[PDB]
Amino acid sequence: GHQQLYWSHPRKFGQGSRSCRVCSNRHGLIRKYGLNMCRQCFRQYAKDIGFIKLD
């Protein structure tokens, strides 16, 4: 049966377990301090979150 089989595959780990919290994209993720957003979205939102480039 499809209803008991469509979500039985374990993605409890791996990069398939994770996605960008703006993009739903699976590459370039920054898990440092639980940002969980891709590198380009973090580039977009770094000043808004509060990471100031001063060095």
């Binding site: 979500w7 919290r21 703006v22 739903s24």
Partner: protein, 96 residues
């Protein structure tokens, strides 16, 4: 979409009791957190609330990974006589 009508009226019941509706973009996650009283996944639905949008009953915005839907005056009039509510049974929108 196939779904019990009991799950369907639980969805519209929450859409009444607070005149908005928020859903994470996930057609795979087991159940809605606010609607844990019922056996209703986010798979079991967001697309019917899109159906209310496409009929005109809600208006949709989609932030980062989260749908938001807003009830309309066109939508309340339909939904109350879909869930067989009188004009006495009203959301927080009609009450102070």
């Amino acid at each position: 979409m196939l779904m019990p009508k009991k799950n369907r009226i639980a969805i519209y019941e929450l859409l009444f009791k607070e005149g908005v509706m928020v859903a994470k973009k996930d057609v795979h996650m087991p159940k809605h957190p606010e609607l844990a009283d019922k056996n209703v996944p986010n798979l079991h639905v967001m697309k019917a609330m899109q159906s209310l949008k496409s009929r005109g009953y809600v208006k949709e915005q989609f932030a980062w990974r989260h749908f938001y839907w807003y009830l309309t005056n066109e939508g309340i009039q339909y939904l109350r006589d879909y869930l067989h509510l009188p004009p006495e049974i009203v959301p927080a929108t009609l009450r102070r």
